[PDB]
Curated annotation (Swiss-Prot):
It is linked to Seborrhea-like dermatitis with psoriasiform elements: Characterized by a chronic fine diffuse scaly erythematous rash on the face, particularly on the chin, nasolabial folds and eyebrows, around earlobes and over the scalp. The rash exacerbate in the winter, with emotional stress and after strenuous physical activity. Hyperkeratosis of skin over the elbows, knees, palms, soles and metacarpophalangeal joints is evident. There is no arthralgia, arthritis or neurological disorders. This is Zinc finger protein 750. It comes from the Eukaryota. It comes from Homo sapiens. Transcription factor involved in epidermis differentiation. Required for terminal epidermal differentiation: acts downstream of p63/TP63 and activates expression of late epidermal differentiation genes. Specifically binds to the promoter of KLF4 and promotes its expression. Expressed in the skin, prostate, lung, placenta and thymus, and at low level in T-cells. Not expressed in peripheral blood leukocytes, pancreas and brain. Clearly expressed in primary keratinocytes but not in fibroblasts. Changing H15A: Abolishes the ability to induce epidermal terminal differentiation. Retains the ability to bind zinc. A zinc finger (CCHC-type) spans 1-27. Zn(2+) binds at C3, C6, H19, C25. Induction: During epidermal differentiation: expression is activated by p63/TP63.
Amino acid sequence: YKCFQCPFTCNEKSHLFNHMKYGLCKN
Ligand SMILES: [Zn+2]
């Protein structure tokens, strides 16, 4: 997916959520 919080992308949203919820990059 796509993440503006920090240059990050993944195979699917489920990972974006995890990436957003993991606190790796908060906005
Ligand atoms: Zn991000």
